[PDB]
From a paper:
The Rix1 complex of the rixosome utilizes Sda1 as landing platform on nucleoplasmic pre‐60S particles to wedge between the 5S rRNA tip and L1‐stalk, thereby facilitating the 180° rotation of the immature 5S RNP towards its mature conformation. Upon rixosome positioning, the other sub‐module with Las1 endonuclease and Grc3 polynucleotide‐kinase can reach a strategic position at the pre‐60S foot to cleave and 5′ phosphorylate the nearby ITS2 pre‐rRNA.
While the cryo‐EM reconstruction of the complete rixosome could only be resolved at low resolution and did not reveal any apparent connecting density, both sub‐complexes could be resolved individually to resolutions of 2.9 Å (Rix1 complex) and 3.0 Å (Las1‐Grc3 complex).
Numbering used by the authors:
A (entry chain E), D (entry chain B): 107 to 340, 348 to 455, 468 to 488, 495 to 568, 608 to 692, 718 to 727
B (entry chain D), C (entry chain A): 1 to 28, 38 to 178, 344 to 363
């Protein structure tokens, strides 16, 4: 049975094309649009609403990425509204990632244009089901009350907790977009920046997997997490204030350090919130039982949120009771229960986010992608032999598990590692940094196995070990990273530390070259066996 | 089409060398030979620990490494002063992991299956399942029983998994020069 | 009336001495002191092994002996060559026995209780329950986590059980002669 | 509601007393009797049936023990039948065990006489429910067919397997009694001996717990297992042919040795069955899953039974299928499924059996008991220092668990140990017998942990270590045993070996003296703490 996604009907008057692939659409009444692919929204007259974001003719062009792996945002136009749809320039690069992974081929529309308007279900690609973005009426009422309280009280803190697959991420995106874009009274009011504390390592937003981050947004989040996996450090639409490497998909390897990371990130938010009023939206892990419940209680005790929002009505009574106790122990903190509106597994989305992060170019749209396979790129050579001033990295620190020194080279090879800047010398205390150096790797023994201190270290970015050369003439690491060369050359060698953790093995990078060669057509690769 | 399975070992030669280190008698006395065998077994168990850290290691390899590590800790020094809870606990955790992984792999959620029924379906002796249950819900099994069951379990894993693998016989950071660069697979220098 | 509880130890002095050997710091540096502490801990774990052989030993005493034996095997020699599956397996079996015994003791068959609900009812941290589940159905937990959890578990058992025990400060075969015989309790010469 | 157990009604004619407590009862019609306590049956006229045993005036007096812990045997008299009921002389000693254990006081009738006829439920003791002995009609039909086949084919082997609490023991007792006492044709036919292969260590009959045995019966088994726990070795009614110490309640410590024991015992049965035709009844453990199913299959393969009888209709299909496969693999062995007609836990009955064994006098009635507490008896002194010819025992062998040598004295003290006769020198090969000897105990190291070989060793009996004296002047063991002094003095010191296993701790013996003192009235005892 055909389901009508878009209520718009085109004719010669309302719907017109323009050179460069752009489109001009004039709706005299309220209309809805479900558009699949990458596009840009710029309204000539009237007000539109997309994913909770309100756009007016004063506002600039907003770039939307809508793969059908996630729910497609619905663009609603009020009466007497003239809008312009623009093709996305950078999107082609992302589509060229289809050459490296079959998963990136299924994401977008099959039409030659970047974006396709989905009038009926027949316009969908074959063997794919399109789901529209939806919000509960209770969600809209709660966000309206939150906006009124935010106008009453400057810089609120909104804690969003819930079970996994409860739709907390969708509610977080609409909450952020409505806090940013919605203006009451004067239409000349500018958009407010919104600061997002992303504390979910397993399913992160604005950060690569295994990373907790603090992000400042002046532009609405209209893209999936893998469409903006890495944001450059700080006038841009989305800038990253600070990151820390959990180096795992779950905090269960070290909960307390996790809490410490949150504290440090919260401190930086305070160093903004003193100067200007900025709402903070906190994204939490989907762990509601066992150690995760204690983690949520500790996060409530640390952050002191203005409100706590549990995203499931039908959640376990022990979890709701523990969260209510954690709220009531501090002060009168309003705890509100919300409905949970709930293909692609989280592990696959995590791998897509990591691949999209590593394919970011070092250099409307924010992010740009490089279609070149990781096997074809010229790698960074990090010198391992010499004085700590001479070496590219100070040493290698293993998180939670101490390999034998002969096994470190095999363990880190072809694996994602974190790059950590040592801001203060107090982080290295208690650890034996190797001195002036087949030569061995510079390995810092970590007998406790705990991560480095968040308040003295920061995360520059993630690297992928292209190879390890332990020859006596030139001991070095070949590695690939999306960090720009200016940032890498700004740091000194004694400030940088490579960190091994429990990131997932980048198995996409191993067969990326094989997929590229197979697509271009129409020896033994390490860690890959082939069926025939 | 072509399907890819990703392995913690770089190539099949690494896996076959680790198999030879676990099983010197099948693949192929003096005190030097015994010390060499013990050292190679320790090297292999360390490699399987690295493989489990990387991810994608099969359950049979982990079970073999756990049983060989328990046997090595038994042979190196028995905890006669401590009553052997170190050695017996190593054996009991190896058996718990081995039986739990095998049963969880071969169980079906659709049909209600007893653990002994799954053990019969796999071909696993029920002695290992009873040993797992005794180590979990009762006191630890005795050291002699754990030794005999560990040797039988290692032989069972050899006949189940290991035999079928094959026949038995700013100068710190420099961008690399684009003229000299030849594309290679990930992990090759 | 008078009710009798039968204990593996002969008297309460034996139990308090074993408590002092498990916990020298609570009941009461130099290398001789460290060696003495290790030897007394080994003696105590051997005594608890004998007690478990006799029968009637409480679960907390067995759990303490298992954790102390795992700690002793860690401290004596780490299996760095073997990757630590001996030591980590000893820790994992100690935790499996400890958590399984506590939960099986305090569970109720009448009411459906999750394992975390029983852990909350006892007061046990859920870290031990997650550690047991990871050691059973997943790979073994890392050595640092097992060390920290073992020390915390030993402190928890001290506060749960050990503190409440007391204040802390044809000539081969000859029938025996009937004239000199005086009746004694069983086990007294 | 009153339930009428006995249909007999007394008057001056049928019911007569006689001095010494004896009773003469003449029933002109078929009557049933439920008698509680210890009595003796001797019929003057007619045929009676008790627990499947048929008694005729030719037969002698048969002694019955009926505690209400087990089902009371029902004595059925045919038409025109005159019987005599006799008090039991030895029973007083058993009743005096009530002075040492409150469990032994609950067993018998409260009337001053040894036996009381239970006409109605009001004649029962207070707070006690009396259950009659019952047999399924299918059981009687199967036993009748078995008797016909036994008359056709000499010396059948009847394997009785089933789940625990399936009533296999009751069926075994009635099967043995009907094979023994039932005579067809000529009434002058004598009773046949029946050999019972008891392979159940957890719930044994004719043997103490932890012991497998081969027993020859010329007199019907009308008593519970704790009323005949130990039988003297070989014209008596019940004699023990051979014994072996499993030293555990289950074979799970060593299954194969268990099978070996059965083989040896079966061999001795063959050394009888060649001379005369004797039926063998095999009692098996109630272990039907896991290793126990393989044990049952191995026992079927070893014994080659004439028929196999599974005692449960509603048994697991995998167990019945495995038993059918084990039967059909050897030959055409008839496998018959039977109904399972199913307070006092098995552990308590095991403790009562062990206490009754250790309270047996060295000298319908067969057994006689000693009311004296075990703490008051003069113990045997076993010399531990000297040559192997000089020592009382050759050494101490631990089964399945090797203690440290300092811990052996604490482990064996106040515990039940087996006394094993080394018939052949091949049993000690591979084991280091200690040489000419605080002196240490003579301890034989057993690195394998396996039990001694059944075909070269035998079990004289069980001992209880009264105490261990490790003084330098006289190292010795004080121990208590029901074995007669002539048997103990017949063996040389180098033939005897003490065996430590997994018998239950004799906690009855520790507080036996306290119970005796408390009953007579109306220091610290090792391993006992007292509530007040």
């Amino acid at each position: 049975l055909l389901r009508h996604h878009s209520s718009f009907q085109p004719n010669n008057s309302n719907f017109q094309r323009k050179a460069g692939g752009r489109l001009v659409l004039s709706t005299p009444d309220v209309e809805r649009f479900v558009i699949l692919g990458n596009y840009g929204v710029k309204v000539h007259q009237g007000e539109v609403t997309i994913a909770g974001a309100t756009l007016t003719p004063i506002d600039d062009v907003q770039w939307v990425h809508a793969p059908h792996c996630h729910a497609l945002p619905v663009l609603r136009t009020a009466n007497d509204t003239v809008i312009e749809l623009l093709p996305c320039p950078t999107a082609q690069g992302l589509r060229e990632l289809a050459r490296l992974n079959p998963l990136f081929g299924r994401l977008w529309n099959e039409t030659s244009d970047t974006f396709q308007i989905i009038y009926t279900s027949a316009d969908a690609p074959k063997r794919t089901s399109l789901r529209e973005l939806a919000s509960h009426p209770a969600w809209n009422k709660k966000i309206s009350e939150l906006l009124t309280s935010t106008r009453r009280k400057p810089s609120p803190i909104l804690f969003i907790c819930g079970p996994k697959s409860s739709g907390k991420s969708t509610f977080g995106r609409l909450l952020t977009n409505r806090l940013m874009t919605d203006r009451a009274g004067h239409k000349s009011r500018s958009w407010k920046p919104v600061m997002v504390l992303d504390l979910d390592p397993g399913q992160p937003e604005f950060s690569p997997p295994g990373v907790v981050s603090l992000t400042k947004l002046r532009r609405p989040n209209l893209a999936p997490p893998f469409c903006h996996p890495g944001l450059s450090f700080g006038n841009e639409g989305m800038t990253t204030v600070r990151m820390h490497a959990i180096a795992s998909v779950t905090p269960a390897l070290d909960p307390a350090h996790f809490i410490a990371c949150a504290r440090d990130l919260f401190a930086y938010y305070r160093r903004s919130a003193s100067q200007e009023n900025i709402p903070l939206v906190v994204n939490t892990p989907g762990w509601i039982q066992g150690t995760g419940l204690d983690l949520l209680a500790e996060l409530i005790a640390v952050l002191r949120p203005t409100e706590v929002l549990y995203m499931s009505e039908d959640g376990p009574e022990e979890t709701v009771s523990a969260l209510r106790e954690a709220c009531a122990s501090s002060s009168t903190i309003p705890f509100t229960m919300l409905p949970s509106q709930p293909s692609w597994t989280p592990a696959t989305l995590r791998s897509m986010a990591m691949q999209s992060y590593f394919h970011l170019s070092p250099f409307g749209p924010g992010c740009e992608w490089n279609p070149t396979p990781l096997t074809h790129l010229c790698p960074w050579r990090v010198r391992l032999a010499g004085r700590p001033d001479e070496r590219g990295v100070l040493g290698i620190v293993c998180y939670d598990h101490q390999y034998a020194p002969e096994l470190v080279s095999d363990a880190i090879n072809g694996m994602v590692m974190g790059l950590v800047r040592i801001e203060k010398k107090e982080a290295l205390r208690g650890l034996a940094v190797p001195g002036d150096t087949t030569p061995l790797l510079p390995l810092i023994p970590n007998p406790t196995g705990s991560p480095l201190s968040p308040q003295y270290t920061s995360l520059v970015g993630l690297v992928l070990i292209r190879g390890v050369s332990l020859t006596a003439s030139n001991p070095e690491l070949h590695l690939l990273t999306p960090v720009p060369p200016s940032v890498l050359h700004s740091f000194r060698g004694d400030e940088l530390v490579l960190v091994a953790g429990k990131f997932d093995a980048p198995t996409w990078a191993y067969v990326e070259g094989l997929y590229w060669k197979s697509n271009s057509k129409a020896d033994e690769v390490p860690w890959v066996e082939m069926l025939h | 089409m072509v399907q890819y399975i990703f392995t913690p070992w770089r190539n099949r030669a690494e896996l076959l060398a680790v198999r030879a280190q676990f099983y010197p008698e099948h693949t192929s006395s003096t005190f030097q030979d015994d010390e060499h065998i013990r050292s190679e077994k320790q090297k292999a168990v360390a490699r399987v620990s690295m493989w489990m850290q990387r991810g994608g290691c099969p359950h049979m390899v982990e079970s073999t490494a756990l049983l060989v590590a328990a046997i090595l800790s038994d042979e190196a020094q028995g905890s006669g002063a401590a009553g052997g809870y170190a050695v017996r606990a190593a054996y009991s955790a190896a058996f718990s992991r081995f039986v739990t992984g095998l049963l969880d792999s071969h169980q079906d959620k659709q049909r209600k299956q007893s653990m002994y029924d799954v053990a019969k379906a796999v071909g696993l002796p029920a002695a290992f399942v009873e040993l797992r249950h005794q180590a979990t819900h009762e006191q630890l099994p005795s050291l002699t029983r754990l030794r005999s069951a560990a040797r039988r379990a290692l032989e069972w894993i050899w006949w189940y998994y290991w035999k079928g693998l094959g026949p038995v016989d700013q100068s710190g950071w420099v961008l690399y020069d684009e003229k000299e660069w030849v594309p290679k697979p990930i992990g090759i220098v």
